[PDB]
Amino acid sequence: KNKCVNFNFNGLTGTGVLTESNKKFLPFQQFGRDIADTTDAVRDPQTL
Amino acid sequence: SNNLDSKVGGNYNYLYRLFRKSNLKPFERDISTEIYQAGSTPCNGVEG
Amino acid sequence: KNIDGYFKIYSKHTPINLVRDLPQGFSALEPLVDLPIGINITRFQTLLA
């Protein structure tokens, strides 16, 4: 967390900084996208 | 799979549809055993 | 609904105080499960107690 790193969560490739935000993910929502339809937040598959 | 699936005398277990009344849509499995017509001639049962 | 053989099932449970036909309101339904059966559905029924 708090480091510029390359992410890959089930094909969701990208680069960014990981942190805990106020996003309230529902039980069925897997990952969110920004206004550009680009993945801006995901959920850890191993442990929720 | 000539040495695996085929057998002496002819392996006639695999089937295929010669024709249908019209072309089917993609990603569609059809297991119907009805006799389909090539043209507009109504057959109504027996072959010919 | 059945989209490309993937049978979608949504669910939403909420309390009400209703004495007439369907409530005139709004409520978002969430997905419950996804059953990839892979068949064409044309009819349906329901069970009652």
Structure commentary:
The structure is cut from a larger assembly and holds 3 copies of chain A. Chain A is mainly β and 48 residues long. Helices cover 0% and strands 35% of the residues of chain A. The first copy, chain A, has strands spanning 4-9, 12-17, 32-33, 39-41. A two-stranded antiparallel ribbon of chain A has the order 1-2. A two-stranded antiparallel ribbon of chain A has the order 3-4. In chain A, strand 1 (4-9) and strand 2 (12-17) form a beta hairpin.
Shape of chain A: globular
Radius of gyration of chain A (Å): 11 Å
Q: What is the N-to-C succession of helices and strands of chain A? A: EEEE
Oligomer: part of a larger assembly
Helical region count of chain A? Answer: 0
Derived from helix and strand composition plus strand pairing, the structural class of chain A reads mainly beta
Termini gap of chain A: 16 Å
Q: Could you give the count of β-strands of chain A?
A: 4
- Largest sheet of chain A, described in full? 2 strands, antiparallel
PDB class: viral protein
Keywords: viral protein
Entry title: S-2H2-F2 structure, two RBDs are up and one RBD is down, each up RBD binds with a 2H2 Fab.
Chains A, B, C: Spike glycoprotein
SSE topology:
The structure is cut from a larger assembly and holds 3 copies of chain A.
Chain A: E1 4-9, E2 12-17, E3 32-33, E4 39-41
Antiparallel strand pairs in A: 1-2, 3-4
What are its keywords?
part of a larger assembly, 3 chains, 48 residues, mainly beta, two-stranded antiparallel sheet, 4 strands, 0% helix, viral protein, Spike glycoprotein
